[PDB]
Amino acid sequence: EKFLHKLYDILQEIPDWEEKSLAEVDSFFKNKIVSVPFVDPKPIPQNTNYKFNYKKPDISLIGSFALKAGIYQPNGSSIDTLLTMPKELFEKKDFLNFRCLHKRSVYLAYLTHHLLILLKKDKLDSFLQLEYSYFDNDPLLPILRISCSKDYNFYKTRFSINLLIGFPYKVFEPKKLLPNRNCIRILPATPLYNFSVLSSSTHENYLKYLYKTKKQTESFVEATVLGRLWLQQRGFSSNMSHSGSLGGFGTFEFTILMAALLNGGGINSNKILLHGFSSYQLFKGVIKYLATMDLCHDGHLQFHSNPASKYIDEGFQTPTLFDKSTKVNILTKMTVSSYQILKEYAGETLRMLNNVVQDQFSNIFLTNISRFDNLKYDLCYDVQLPLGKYNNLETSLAATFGSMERVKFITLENFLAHKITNVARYALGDRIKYIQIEMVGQKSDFPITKRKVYSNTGGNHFNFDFVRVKLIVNPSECDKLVTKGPAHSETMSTEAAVFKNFWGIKSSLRRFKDGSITHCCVWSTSSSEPIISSIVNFALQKHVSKKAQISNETIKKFHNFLPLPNLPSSAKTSVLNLSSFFNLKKSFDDLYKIIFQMKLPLSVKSILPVGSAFRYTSLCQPVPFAYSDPDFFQDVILEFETDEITSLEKAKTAFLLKIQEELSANSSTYRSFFSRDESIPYNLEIVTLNILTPEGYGFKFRVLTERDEILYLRAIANARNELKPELEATFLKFTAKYLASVRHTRTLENISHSYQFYSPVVRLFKRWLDTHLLLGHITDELAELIAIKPFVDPAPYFIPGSLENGFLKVLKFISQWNWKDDPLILDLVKPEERLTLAQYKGIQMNFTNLRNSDPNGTHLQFFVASKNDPSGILYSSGIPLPIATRLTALAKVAVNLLQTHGLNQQTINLLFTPGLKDYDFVVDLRTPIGLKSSCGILSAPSNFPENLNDLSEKMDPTYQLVKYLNLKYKNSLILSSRKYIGVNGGEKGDKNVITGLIKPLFKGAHKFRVNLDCNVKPVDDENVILNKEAIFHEIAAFGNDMVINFETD
């Protein structure tokens, strides 16, 4: 404030200089160091008969500071100080053909020059910095910017000062400057010119109205800061959004709209916003309004800064809040896609504020969403634009840039931006939801010695390097094969004409099975990129510029890392194809009918599959006969119609005998055998009936009976007090496998068919965790739930619609997770049976009691619950805290590599490579046979062998190795390995690694106990230290023929 008062004194000291011509001011600012930042196109001596002038301007304050609603910006804010021009300096024919604009430009040039001289007098020049900029990045409006560096040293305030020179109230006719009106003679409207000049004419009056409403209401400043911070986290500002910039709406516009809503708002002009509201009331009201009330296409809003606001059903195809008191459109800095994306954010925040069960404040206000563009947007392509020169446009750009072109898009920035925007938007259509363009390289500032900003990089002479096109896609309409066009008649319609023209060679005329005659254009999907990518490639290089270069190698590498099944046409088969899953389901349903028509001492009550392939989450897509796949034999819970554990289990096996007998009898095409199952503890009689189907598919059947859980609870009750927790763990495993498994696979199937991309995202996540060897400890369902967390809970983001976006959101969430304090509770449900607040409180009290009896997760680290499981433990138990922290550190280091090295295929390969460090020992093994082809991932099997023992021969034993080895040394050693050799075994899929850490307690020596449970070597006659070399030798003995190398700490 003291500094601004000194500035006002300095200005009142600044002298005035008179009417001069272009040559006079030219010599003036040629022999002065300051160069007039002239607004393009510059004035010319042949078309300049009016003259120039500067007098003492009209000082004032305006902005968030004048509204007293500024905050302590960490990066730094600024205060706008307006200095309008004299109405005597103004003539009534100055609002045509850049006259008043050149007026403002020379006004500001002399102003900054002589304030610089007064600075050279006052000696604040050693710490003060003076420069040019554009009012909210508006090239038609240059402004002065004052900053400082480390007695008016205001640099610690981190503020800045904006010197703007508008025009007085009602100098030129607002109805001659209405957006419809033309004022650049060469006839088309000049909306941007209209906006700039009229806003400069009526800046301060808007501040008067804003302050008046701030005095009429009570929580106005709070609502202002609320909206400002919401928008700031959203990545929104008041700058001109026409230039490949997301903006046009910030604090100033937010406040004007809030005041207009207090001045009306409805279509019936009535007061939707009431001056008695609170902060949250006002903010929720305004967000609900911008979410429910279109302002661009089918309706617009109306008010008067001096009369109630009224909504009308005419949208001017541009965000239009129309002030009649000034004849101005408020949002004139806003692009249509910008308004759309802001309205979508508005609806999202509305639904958040309507969430009654879970709080949403942390996500709404305390999360910056604009940090990683590939998280904020599903699709993003880089396009180098070597456009070149002002004259070289005629040969670089396909389109034209003529007189009306420049009158409309005064800036070639706006021209190119909007051109590529519209061409991509049309040529894509429903394949996407929302579009944005980012002119990579664009700037706003420049020193005083210049006439504008200047750039020479990226094959251009304009402010950018290249263009990054961002898209929020629609998945259900993404992988649609054909680009459908309009119908076909003899007299070619206007729509069909324009369509065929736009599509050139791609256009054609195809007929369909239903009998329709419509134009179209067809593509062929690729298992390495999306058809949207092909389309943007073609349309961009066709209707914009033959010199453009286009790619997204990032998404290329994502789809490359995706596993490719050894299937015909898999090369052209996209990600969103589930044909393999459907074929497996169909074979299984045939088998289903066979067993249901079988006859038995019981009637078959139900046959429910619980296969990961069924729930669309297996690492790979199934391939007939590819039985070396770990996920080949899918589980099928068989349940029969309605007292000792052993007799019960052997009766189960006897029913399997009968089934297998009748099956070998009357379904000889199938093959069958019995496998000992030992995945469940302390049950030594469970037998799974493996069935082999000439669709090359394999299942395992297990009889479920209610007497299982009955006898299990009986044993729980009968066990000793210290023995209890072990049988608790065993019963938990049983429940996870037999009941919650079925419930989970059901609900997950449903929500996946609603969220398509969930299946590929979770498959990629499983791949990544297999590369990181954590799969030996992590159970599939756990990872599935973690990876479904982003879709079912997208706050603040949007639902992912690209494999990259989904993978990165999963990793971001895991990284920022704090399982020690934070729980996880998922509302498994289609988009708009969610949890009651009652169930929510129940799950939360569950979490609180668990974390009370375990405040540091030595027994349970990740806690995740849902309707299927109100316990939050079923897929999280049995995981060591070293594994947990290793996972979280992996996520964090990955997010940091992304933060730093930039997103590239190299960073992705760095993600996929395993750390293999911190491992007390690392055994590198290779299996004698190759297994990539047999596993059926692309680098082919074609029957079942004649011996089932030889099926087993082709199987993979390293899983057995690591599991049983952990069973033995589970008292002393923690191990990890690779589960899927067919993807993580090199070029043959045959290389694995056993990475192990020592338990830090048995690391040392201890008392020689009868139940110490380790291979030790005493250091004395009473104290015993662990026997490392013995351990390694025992590992070598166990894996004698497959251990190839050992590497110690």
Per CB under 8 A, contacts with another protein among 822-861 are 830, 833
Q: What is the DSSP letter of 47?
A: G
Q: Site for another protein (CB under 8 A): which residue of 153, 279, 549, 1015?
A: 1015
**Please, which residue, 372 or 944, has the CB nearer to another protein?**
944
| Torsion region of 158: left, alpha or beta (phi above 0 gives left; psi -120 to 50 gives alpha) | left
Partnered with residue 703 across adjacent β-strands are 638
Q: What is the DSSP letter of 86?
A: P
**Please, which residue, 129 or 1045, has the CB nearer to another protein?**
1045
Q: Does 1021 bind another protein (CB under 8 A)?
A: yes
Q: Site for another protein (CB under 8 A): which residue of 514, 722, 946, 987?
A: 514
Contacts made by residues 955-960, CB under 8 angstroms, sequence distance 24+: 955/627, 955/628, 956/628, 956/630, 956/927, 956/931, 956/981, 957/1042, 958/925, 958/927, 958/992, 958/994, 958/1042, 959/630
The least CB distance from residue 554 to another protein, in Å, is 27
Return the HEC string of 651-662: HHHHHHHHHHHH
The least CB distance from residue 1041 to another protein, in Å, is 5
**Please, which residue, 373 or 1034, has the CB nearer to another protein?**
1034
Helix (H, G, I), strand (E, B) or coil at 674: strand
The least CB distance from residue 593 to another protein, in Å, is 10
**Please, which residue, 404 or 948, has the CB nearer to another protein?**
948
Q: Site for another protein (CB under 8 A): which residue of 199, 566, 690, 802?
A: 690
Window contacting another protein (CB under 8 A); options: 258-266, 461-469, 678-686, 849-857 = 678-686
The least CB distance from residue 660 to another protein, in Å, is 8
Window contacting another protein (CB under 8 A); options: 132-140, 189-197, 599-607, 879-887 = 599-607
Q: Does 422 bind another protein (CB under 8 A)?
A: no
Quickly count: other Cβ atoms within 10 Å of residue 326's Cβ: 22
Q: Site for another protein (CB under 8 A): which residue of 5, 175, 546, 714?
A: 714
Return d(Cα 1028, Cα 972) in angstroms, integer. Answer: 11
**Please, which residue, 311 or 581, has the CB nearer to another protein?**
581
Phi and psi torsions of 576, nearest 5°? -85, 25
**Please, which residue, 18 or 1013, has the CB nearer to another protein?**
1013
**Binding string to another protein for residues 899 to 938, with x set by CB under 8 A, is what?**
------------------------x----x----------
Binding positions for another protein, 955-994, rule CB under 8 A: 955, 957, 960-961, 964, 967-968, 970-971
The least CB distance from residue 728 to another protein, in Å, is 11
**Please, which residue, 4 or 948, has the CB nearer to another protein?**
948
Partnered with residue 470 across adjacent β-strands are 380, 436
Residue 652 Cα distances to 247, 378, 581, 684, angstroms: 67, 50, 29, 13
> Which of 821, 817, 822 lies closest to 887, judged by CA?
817
Q: Site for another protein (CB under 8 A): which residue of 153, 269, 358, 683?
A: 683
Phi and psi torsions of 80, nearest 5°? -85, 125
**Please, which residue, 275 or 714, has the CB nearer to another protein?**
714
**Please, which residue, 451 or 979, has the CB nearer to another protein?**
979
Binding positions for another protein, 933-962, rule CB under 8 A: 948-949, 952-953, 955, 957, 960-961
Are 124 and 147 contacting, i.e. CB atoms less than 8 angstroms apart? no
> Which of 137, 135, 152 lies closest to 83, judged by CA?
135
> Which of 67, 280, 323 lies closest to 170, judged by CA?
323
Q: Site for another protein (CB under 8 A): which residue of 1, 88, 313, 644?
A: 644
Binding positions for another protein, 434-493, rule CB under 8 A: 476
The least CB distance from residue 476 to another protein, in Å, is 7
Counted residue by residue, the chain has a size of: 1049
Tokens representing 268 are 């019936």
Window contacting another protein (CB under 8 A); options: 17-25, 255-263, 304-312, 1006-1014 = 1006-1014
The least CB distance from residue 648 to another protein, in Å, is 10
Helix (H, G, I), strand (E, B) or coil at 611: coil
**Please, which residue, 178 or 1042, has the CB nearer to another protein?**
1042
Are 35 and 449 contacting, i.e. CB atoms less than 8 angstroms apart? yes
Are 140 and 195 contacting, i.e. CB atoms less than 8 angstroms apart? no
Q: Does 673 bind another protein (CB under 8 A)?
A: yes
> What is 308-373 written as a DSSP string?
--EEES---SS--EEETTTTEETTTT--HHHHHHHHHHHHHHHHHHH-SSS--HHHHHS---SS-H
**Please, which residue, 136 or 869, has the CB nearer to another protein?**
869
Give residue 392's identity as a one-letter amino acid code: N
Residue 426 Cα distances to 400, 414, 432, 798, 855, angstroms: 19, 18, 10, 23, 56
Quickly count: other Cβ atoms within 10 Å of residue 318's Cβ: 18
Sign of CA dihedral 976, 980, 982, 983: negative
**Binding string to another protein for residues 326 to 365, with x set by CB under 8 A, is what?**
----------------------------------------
The least CB distance from residue 356 to another protein, in Å, is 20
Q: Does 645 bind another protein (CB under 8 A)?
A: yes
Q: Which residue has the tokens 């400002």?
A: 228
Partnered with residue 702 across adjacent β-strands are 637
**Please, which residue, 246 or 727, has the CB nearer to another protein?**
727
Q: Site for another protein (CB under 8 A): which residue of 505, 665, 838, 1010?
A: 1010
Quickly count: other Cβ atoms within 10 Å of residue 323's Cβ: 24
Tokens representing 410 are 């005064």
**Please, which residue, 833 or 987, has the CB nearer to another protein?**
833
Binding positions for another protein, 567-596, rule CB under 8 A: 582, 585-586, 596
| Torsion region of 773: left, alpha or beta (phi above 0 gives left; psi -120 to 50 gives alpha) | left
Q: Site for another protein (CB under 8 A): which residue of 33, 492, 684, 837?
A: 684
Are 481 and 531 contacting, i.e. CB atoms less than 8 angstroms apart? yes
Return d(Cα 72, Cα 68) in angstroms, integer. Answer: 12
Q: Does 705 bind another protein (CB under 8 A)?
A: no
The least CB distance from residue 676 to another protein, in Å, is 6
**Binding string to another protein for residues 715 to 754, with x set by CB under 8 A, is what?**
x--xx---x--xx--x---------------xx-xx--xx
Residue 725 burial by CB count (10 A; 0-12/13-18/19+): exposed, middle or buried?
Answer: exposed
**Please, which residue, 352 or 1042, has the CB nearer to another protein?**
1042
Tokens representing 40 are 């393009």
The least CB distance from residue 511 to another protein, in Å, is 10
**Please, which residue, 436 or 958, has the CB nearer to another protein?**
958
Tokens representing 322 are 């129309």
Q: Site for another protein (CB under 8 A): which residue of 653, 735, 779, 885?
A: 653
Q: Does 1016 bind another protein (CB under 8 A)?
A: yes
Window contacting another protein (CB under 8 A); options: 48-56, 176-184, 305-313, 669-677 = 669-677
Q: Site for another protein (CB under 8 A): which residue of 47, 292, 516, 909?
A: 516
The least CB distance from residue 650 to another protein, in Å, is 5
**Please, which residue, 588 or 768, has the CB nearer to another protein?**
588
The least CB distance from residue 986 to another protein, in Å, is 19
Window contacting another protein (CB under 8 A); options: 195-203, 773-781, 981-989, 1036-1044 = 1036-1044
Tokens representing 527 are 């298992």
Return d(Cα 1019, Cα 1016) in angstroms, integer. Answer: 9
